[PDB]
Design a protein around this ligand. Sequence first.
Ligand SMILES: *[C@@H]1O[C@H](CO)[C@@H](O[C@@H]2O[C@H](CO)[C@@H](O)[C@H](O)[C@H]2NC(C)=O)[C@H](O)[C@H]1NC(C)=O
Ligand SMILES: *[C@@H]1O[C@H](CO)[C@@H](O)[C@H](O)[C@H]1NC(C)=O
Ligand SMILES: OC[C@H]1O[C@@H](O)[C@H](O)[C@@H](O)[C@H]1O
Length: 705
Amino acid sequence: EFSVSYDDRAIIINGKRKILISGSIHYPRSTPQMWPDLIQKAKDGGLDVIETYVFWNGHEPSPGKYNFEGRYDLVRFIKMVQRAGLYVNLRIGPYVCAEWNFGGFPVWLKYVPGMEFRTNNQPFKVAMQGFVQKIVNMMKSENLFESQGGPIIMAQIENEYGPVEWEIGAPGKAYTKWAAQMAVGLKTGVPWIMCKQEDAPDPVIDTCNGFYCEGFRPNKPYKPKMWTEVWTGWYTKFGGPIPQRPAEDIAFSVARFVQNNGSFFNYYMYHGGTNFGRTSSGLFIATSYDYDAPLDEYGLLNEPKYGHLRDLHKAIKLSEPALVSSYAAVTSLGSNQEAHVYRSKSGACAAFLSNYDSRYSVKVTFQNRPYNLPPWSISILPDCKTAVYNTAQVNSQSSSIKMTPAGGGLSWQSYNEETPTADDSDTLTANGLWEQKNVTRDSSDYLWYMTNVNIASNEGFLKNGKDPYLTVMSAGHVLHVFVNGKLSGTVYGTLDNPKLTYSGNVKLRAGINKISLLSVSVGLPNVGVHYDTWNAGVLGPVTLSGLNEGSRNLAKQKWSYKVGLKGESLSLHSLSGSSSVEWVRGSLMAQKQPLTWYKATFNAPGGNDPLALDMASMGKGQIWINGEGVGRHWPGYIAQGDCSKCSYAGTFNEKKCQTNCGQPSQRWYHVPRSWLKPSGNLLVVFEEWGGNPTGISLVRRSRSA
Ligand SMILES: *[C@@H]1O[C@H](CO)[C@@H](O[C@@H]2O[C@H](CO)[C@@H](O)[C@H](O)[C@H]2NC(C)=O)[C@H](O)[C@H]1NC(C)=O
Ligand SMILES: *[C@@H]1O[C@H](CO)[C@@H](O)[C@H](O)[C@H]1NC(C)=O
Ligand SMILES: OC[C@H]1O[C@@H](O)[C@H](O)[C@@H](O)[C@H]1O
């Protein structure tokens, strides 16, 4: 009664070939209070399927101790999709990439003896098989595979391993084969897929990711052609612009794929959402994962994209009897124009009329009728006669985004974070520089590396008008250099170049000088061959020049380590209270000072509409509401890029339609309404850089035509 199989044409569900429309919604990038609404909008937007990764590091924070509660309740999310009448593509991974912290891998996994990720390595295979088996058993135990009457019609193993395999050689080939066999061996009763994996072994279907995939062919003629990631935009990085992808180009790319025998395509992202807390975002990934998705970060319709793709879906559904009972037949119409025709013996006929010219409209004649094709567009004729839809003709109105201040003027108190020093009265001393992940195990973004330097009274710089020069090199990602308790300077990296060098004159004086380096990670790397081997933190070298001796390398002296902030140890973000402390209010309140905690109590704004905090007056740090981590803020990191105006027409790339250049890369921080109560809400901000909290406002989001 229930089965999933496939043939050369399509995935076959309960014995019927289907042209499946899918979108990605990542369950932990929204709240369970949002999920039913997002799913309903996806259903109303013409999706047949919801696609999600599974996020291992979220589900297994320490070995053998699992978390499937709150926004990590994977079972509940899938059951909501089932309820709405949609299928699921479960992308287990468990490497998932996804601009997600460490690619999804638990940081603890890295420190298992003998471990090597994403290769033919026994401890990795054991841990990966163990978690995949855990997920498969949990789905089975809830009857969630389609073969059981549930929604899951397919699962993905690994993610984009093909390029890695290719670079790492024979051990990559072995691990590929192993992974595919281990997955198929779990007997889910439904197909397995691998994206970007030309050599995926039968019975696994290899699939295509990208802005366009119309030229892609699966690795056997008896496998269907599937596009697992139709990129709907691109991610936002701290320091980068907000990338957009025009609806007309997306619609063209989808029509181009479908007209060429493609039978599954999935929008990545459909709802992008938010990297809440501090274990979600990947390296330098913004708290917003909006992605220019059909549903915006806050869950509102992104018009006109949402409606324009809804209308495309309607056309595809009208075409579907023809699509599933024939194969595409191409007739050339002109220099840059084609007809892709699906003509069934049943009499059903659907046609796609294309104009690949990126500059000019062209009139074609098809079956005796003229059809005007705007540049870079495809018309869909679900009966081979009536052009119900053209990918460049948008009948949805656009809606523009407003973030309007609500409430106004919170009453703040502040608390200044200690600058610690190498008091040899520290539980963490070592005679060298240790890598940050190793020391913190990613329990905090912050690690203090501290050392004392003795200056002789007879140093020449003390007589002459001069300061010596300190160089600190770090693997990244932000570094604050404190000398004798005072911030001397701050440097910070980029996604592509997280490494840092601080070099500057420092105000050392005679006698003992205290150097305290605060090293900060901003999410962990999530993509790249051997990315899990890359370092963070101050590994040096660290040198002082300009002394009577010459230069003094400090890398082998006693280093003292403090993991995390004092406010983190005192739980200042917490509703109970973060070890209390002397909060300051009114005139003496700390302002534009580094390492300052701020807190305010507030009533929830009115309305049903989404909320954010406007953090433009702030610098960098973390936000909590009622003890729950809203995410990192970094409004001080200005967007740089090329924000040239763009046309939908012609080949898209992720830099073609960038917006927000010269603004904070993220100014507004999403606050889920369900996290609030009517009154007595506690807002805690840790401000790492320096800010004026009086400028913080709650804002309400709306979009109108
Ligand atoms: C769409 O798909 C079908 C089947 O995948 C293609 O039909 C095949 O065409 C090749 C080369 O002409 C033949 O060797 C196959 O045996 C055909 N298969 C069947 C079952 O008809 C078709 O050519 C593809 N169309 C386009 C436009 O790419
Ligand atoms: C990792 O931590 C241990 C101490 O807990 C230390 O012995 C080792 O050298 C560290 N290695 C690094 C930082 O690469
Ligand atoms: O947003 C870019 C996307 O890149 C794809 O290659 C990857 O599979 C996704 O997980 C995501 O990282």
